[PDB]
Design a protein around this ligand. Structure first.
Ligand SMILES: Cc1ccc(-c2cc3c(NC(P(=O)(O)O)P(=O)(O)O)ncnc3s2)cc1
Ligand SMILES: Cc1ccc(-c2cc3c(NC(P(=O)(O)O)P(=O)(O)O)ncnc3s2)cc1
Ligand SMILES: [Mg+2]
Ligand SMILES: [Mg+2]
Ligand SMILES: [Mg+2]
Ligand SMILES: [Mg+2]
Ligand SMILES: [Mg+2]
Ligand SMILES: [Mg+2]
Lengths: 343, 343
């Protein structure tokens, strides 16, 4: 209902993102070709998403301002920062898909896989990163929050990259790494790699855009948004395998990439010594017979219905945290976020 | 003499960089392994350089402060920001070497080529990027310049990436791109891709650290530092081919990568229609017989002595710009920089 509303409005505003970010032509005719390529990047990589995070910034902003203070220019900034989160996202997936060897994403071939692109993808990725802060200076350079956002976006990139380093240290190509797959490792991973940016960031951004910068208020918010954070990825890793690729818009590479997924983690808790051995022979390998034998094993331990279980268990716990912790904020923020991620 | 002095002092201070950047252990035991890997990155990629830029920040700072204001903590910040530029550098080369397919750099194998690393190099690279701003908040969070530096480092990353996009758009693997190799393109390239960060940045950083933030003072400085900027890369591209690999610490990939180098540019101005054709058949290809036939052609048009010519021509012009433009600043800044890059 509530994201469903302002989505289209959120997406039209992407025409101006691109306009502004590439309005340097007669001033710098030399670099016009870099700026075209830039456009081409943004069109391809910032678009197709569920735009949930970018939206989340916008919805949160409305919710947290007295509409007597939501003037035209405040909403200008409101969805600008929205778009910045989308860029951040886009930055991450473009790099992520080289690193994770992915084939497709958002219903089309990965940027880095297009012929004529390949590893220029890396430079492209960091460009999106840059555009984030380019906008900030544009639309927020004179706000009292301008600096808090910059630090937020960065403090959040770092955290994402720390997560990403764990992801990979825990998931070497070649090395049977079942010992490494503990739930203690896992919670750490999705915390840094997912929760902070896909949740704390967007919300937090708007908190600062609403003049709300108390450490304790941010801390509570954080407490809540790291769970939603966390479930979200267990759902990502679930969908990776049992999800519909015409609906996820991507193909899963978790078994092949020897990844510390929720699944392999639970699988291990419930392994008969023999089973441990089947998985051992099969996990972390390109071969489809092996990837298949594992998918069977996950089904052989009825993990999909276990995921259905945690989904309820977590919905219920996330909801307790909202009650315990939302205030002084309007609980519609978090609720709106939960509706949009639970099934 | 002057860089030769504070180099060793500059390099000892790298023990504390690593200490500080990895002093989160008992506070966050979960992520200790990411932070080890981080250490490993920094050790490998921030070290071995000529540390010229990092130094340049430090030397410039002394030169531009009354030593009654150069207290212990000002020099703490002074070389911290030094190190930040080194990180920025390191960020760029780690990504650069994947993108440019380089084999070696700084007298050893490229990070991304080590076995067990490969494309995790990409995540590693952005980590260095992050550390920059991690330090800033650490040692400069309470300074009046703190924000100007952040914007400088970013405004400079973007510019570097724009350059880098030109680099690559101008240099597709496969496509004979001799038409594209004009000196108008070239000046644009090395301007964004090299001059801004290896020169304007370090100096400018210290200008702001010395409380000097007038647009016109920065503008003049910029005018001067973009030439030094520019020559520096023509020397890089010269050395790429005719340089000593036990002294550059790297092997050149400009012909192989179909790059818009100073050389191919000059080569083209002086081409007999036939010659244009030899180069045509040979440029932009892995094959060593072809790379060889080109190196011959550059020697066949006595370009090395032409480089010796521009070197003098540019030394002389750079020096005119210092006279025309240094003030109110101490001309020893720029001079010190020129001594250290001219032969
Ligand atoms: C450098 C870098 C650092 C972190 C990422 C992240 C990817 C990602 C993400 N993507 C998912 P996917 O896009 O479903 O593959 P992952 O399982 O690869 O992590 N989902 C939630 N958080 C993150 S953070 C991507 C690139
Ligand atoms: C993403 C990115 C963007 C820019 C770079 C740059 C590499 C580089 C550089 N490296 C030299 P090299 O390190 O001698 O190969 P290049 O000819 O590849 O540009 N020298 C001067 N400026 C720059 S900027 C590297 C990575
Ligand atoms: Mg992935
Ligand atoms: Mg991943
Ligand atoms: Mg995933
Ligand atoms: Mg290179
Ligand atoms: Mg290059
Ligand atoms: Mg070069």
């Amino acid at each position: 209902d509530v994201y469903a509303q302002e989505k289209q409005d959120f997406v039209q505003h992407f025409s101006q993102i691109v306009r502004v970010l590439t309005e340097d032509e007669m001033g710098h005719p030399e670099i016009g070709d870099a700026i075209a390529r830039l456009k081409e990047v943004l069109e391809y990589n910032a678009i197709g998403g569920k735009y949930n995070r970018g939206l989340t910034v916008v919805v949160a902003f409305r919710e947290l301002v007295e509409p007597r203070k939501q003037d035209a220019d405040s909403l200008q900034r409101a969805w600008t920062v929205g778009w910045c989160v989308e860029l951040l996202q886009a930055f991450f997936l473009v790099a992520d898909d080289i690193m994770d060897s992915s084939l497709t994403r958002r219903g089309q071939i990965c940027w880095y896989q297009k012929p004529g692109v390949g590893l220029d993808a890396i430079n492209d990725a960091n460009l999106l990163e840059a555009c984030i802060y380019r906008l900030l200076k544009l639309y927020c350079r004179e706000q009292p929050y301008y600096l808090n956002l910059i630090e937020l976006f960065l403090q959040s990139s770092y955290q994402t990259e720390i997560g990403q380093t764990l992801d990979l240290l825990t998931a070497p190509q070649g090395n049977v790494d079942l010992v490494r797959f503990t739930e203690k490792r896992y919670k750490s991973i999705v915390k840094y790699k997912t929760a902070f940016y896909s949740f704390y960031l967007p919300i937090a951004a708007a908190m600062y855009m609403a003049g709300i910068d108390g450490e304790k208020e941010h801390a509570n918010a954080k407490k809540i948004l790291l769970e939603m954070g966390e479930f979200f990825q267990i759902q990502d890793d679930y969908l990776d395998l049992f999800g519909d690729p015409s609906v996820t818009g991507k193909i899963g590479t978790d078994i092949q990439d020897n990844k510390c997924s929720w699944l392999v983690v639970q699988c291990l808790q419930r392994a008969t010594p023999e089973q441990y051995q089947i998985l051992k022979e099969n996990y972390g390998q390109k071969e489809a017979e092996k990837v298949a034998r594992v998918k069977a094993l996950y089904e052989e331990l009825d993990l999909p219905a276990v995921f259905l279980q945690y989904e309820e268990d977590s919905y219920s716990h996330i909801m307790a945290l909202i009650e315990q912790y939302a205030a002084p904020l309007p609980p519609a923020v978090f609720l709106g976020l939960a509706r949009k991620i639970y099934k």
